Design a protein around this ligand. Structure first.
Ligand SMILES: [Mg+2]
Ligand SMILES: [Mg+2]
Lengths: 430, 430
């Protein structure tokens, strides 16, 4: 219906840093509240989030400016508009901003309202968000419960150990329902902690709820995980598959990839692609995110030609949820998958556009969370509403992560067979 | 106001363990949803939460039984009843259970429904939860934003260090509103990280979202904290006071109290009462939770006459949220504050009763959280709706904690001046 009021406030995320949370009100008492995850405040590739440089507030990470944009212009600009029309609401906001990277109001402001709007509209139509999204996509009944790749071991910049891979994940492909999948992840999660304690390592979770023990090498990280899956009564490859985020840009120096977890050995773009290939042979690894540097396109073309047929090559920093970039990659045969971060683009409309493009190209879409999350679980409704097939929302710890898993349980509970859990079949190259 | 549907489900908590969530649907489209925090499966004092005990699932932590109780007997015994009468809804459940500790259906099953019911009624009356609560309490006008005692440094059995005290907290008493108080904690929280980071300490957070560094003594814990508050641009005592949870139950043996942190040593219950009296002199510690074992009632009598004058004696494991125990305590002059955990009693009606008896005796009530939380932020609306003045819901990390604060912010933004932030005045003993 019609928007009669838009409220914007400043709340705290899962890491203690401020963030925006819109609240679109429609005629009839209907309301839709949503928050925005942490994003990049700097850079010339992705939509930036506006934070106040005010160092006398949250060490300079406040978002009153962005919040002001919501209450100020954004509000008055959306008042009277038909929230039911998503593309339109996201259009009159991105244009008002004027800039391309949404620097004026900030992506953390446009997204907050963008989502809140969708939820508000979904309420007026007497239906869940995942149902409304499906309609906006033009695929109403087309649902599916996303196969989750759960963070379990952290390394690189997200840890202080001899592990290069930023994060190791597990995928309960053997499950028949997302509910069973979540349980499997929980059990392995707790069993890993047992293995880490026996090894005298720290079991204190991280930002994503996973463990960041001081492992002496990449192999050890893969070993502790393998031992966990077994102790949990599951078989590697059959019940659980392994996914990973290399974040290769982190260990890319002087045109080469230096892995400290490999004894500080150096690898050329081509050599690393073969190093990963060898890993996918000794381990059930079926998904590799950012296996190379975002600029190493020539290398990605090679990695895709060698792994793209059997292993899913997900681009995170490579595509930064951008249609232009992803479009070029598709034509140049770069990768075969993309990680979706709606806060990295700004709106739901654009996010949907990115998911559709990947689908049309044969690429897989992995709806992802962010390091700084909130109670919000929109990505859960987004994954199901667009039948993304896969989701990346953390480990089985910390509500900022588990909130998404609980939402998936609620959703699958109300959809049953209407939203099947395809497991492996969702993973490219499977 | 008429209950038409009530469904229960098994969800995951912030710790990866299963928990119960319930939905109470009322005639007219009104629905309330709430989940219970993790409690105690056994025990002979507090309400017992029901767990399946099947090693095959969730390592025996499944709650399918308690979930059935909600969907089956409980629901069938509530259909058509007036959800608007909280006291009536809980009675039917309490009597249907037929046990003291609610060990038949499980405190978690009843609690989840009891809270979902209240949230449903609130909506049916076109009013928020905190407003419905205040009314059920018989004080529709009273409102107040509680002073949050944010955890920040854990010890004892809550960390692998040398600190005997279970947890150290900070209280943003220097704030004018809970919103600002939250900002203070957020700031203090982040600075302590730099202090530990620079000291080669681990910054990984615990279940509470706080820090578990490898400190060498209680004095050092109070050192890094104080050093953190100052570095943040705040002054102890004036802007940020201190609170701690001794949990003497962890080091109480042979009638004495041992302290590994203070080297192999232990002293009479009388000495420890004076030991703490020293900390309340050297440091701005105004709140001490379980400064003695729950059995040492005589010791508490002295501590109440030694510190009960200028220090707040919060009873957690002492009262375990139970009127039968708090009453006898008030008479014998034991403590002057009680930690409120509704999942420890079983229902909202019984929880309000506990809070009422607290204020009716001068004692202060601290709406608390549990180790295993969820996206649920009910305790936030409970504190306000009852003007408890104090709340213990973790640090400024992990959405399972910050969810409560964000809700507190949303509330203070709606009530405005109606919900005052008394500040240090709330703390019993000022
Ligand atoms: Mg990444
Ligand atoms: Mg306690």
């Amino acid at each position: 219906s019609k928007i009669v009021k838009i409220i914007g406030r400043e709340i705290i995320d899962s890491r203690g840093n401020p963030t925006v949370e819109a609240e679109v009100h429609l005629e009839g008492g209907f309301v839709g509240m949503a928050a925005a995850p942490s994003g990049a405040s700097t850079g010339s590739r992705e939509a930036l989030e506006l934070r106040d440089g005010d160092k006398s507030r949250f060490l300079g990470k406040g978002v009153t400016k962005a919040v002001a944009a919501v209450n100020g212009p954004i509000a008055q600009a959306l008042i009277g508009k038909d929230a039911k029309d998503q593309a339109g609401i996201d259009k009159i906001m991105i244009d008002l901003d004027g800039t391309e990277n949404k620097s004026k109001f900030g992506a953390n402001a446009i997204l907050a309202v963008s989502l809140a709007n969708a939820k508000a509209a979904a309420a007026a139509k007497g239906m869940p968000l995942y149902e409304h999204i499906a309609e906006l996509n033009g695929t109403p009944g087309k649902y599916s419960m996303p196969v989750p790749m759960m963070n379990i071991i952290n390394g690189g910049e997200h840890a202080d150990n001899n592990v290069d891979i930023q994060e190791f994940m597990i995928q309960p492909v053997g499950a028949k329902t997302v509910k069973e999948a979540i349980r499997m992840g929980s059990e392995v999660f707790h069993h890993l902690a047992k293995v880490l304690k026996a090894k005298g390592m720290n079991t204190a979770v991280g930002d994503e709820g996973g463990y960041a023990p001081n492992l002496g090498s990449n192999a050890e990280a893969l070993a502790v995980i393998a031992e966990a899956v077994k102790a949990a009564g599951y078989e590697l490859g059959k019940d659980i598959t392994l996914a990973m985020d290399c974040a290769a840009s982190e260990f890319y120096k002087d045109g080469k990839y230096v892995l400290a977890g490999e004894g500080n050995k150096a690898f050329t773009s081509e050599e690393f692609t073969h190093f990963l290939e060898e890993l996918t042979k000794q381990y059930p690894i079926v998904s590799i995110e950012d296996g190379l540097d975002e600029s190493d396109w020539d290398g990605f073309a090679y990695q895709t030609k060698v792994l793209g047929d059997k292993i899913q090559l997900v681009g995170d920093d490579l595509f930064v949820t951008n249609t232009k970039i992803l479009k070029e990659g598709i034509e140049k045969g770069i990768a075969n998958s993309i990680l979706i971060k709606f806060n990295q683009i700004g709106s739901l409309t654009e996010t949907l556009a990115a998911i559709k493009m990947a689908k049309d190209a044969g690429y897989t879409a992995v709806i992802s969370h962010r390091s700084g999350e909130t109670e919000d679980a929109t990505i859960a409704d987004l994954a199901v509403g667009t039948a993304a097939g896969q989701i990346k929302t953390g480990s089985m710890s910390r509500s900022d992560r588990v909130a998404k898993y609980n939402q998936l349980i609620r959703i699958e509970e109300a959809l049953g067979e209407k939203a099947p859990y395809n497991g492996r079949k969702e993973i490219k190259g499977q």
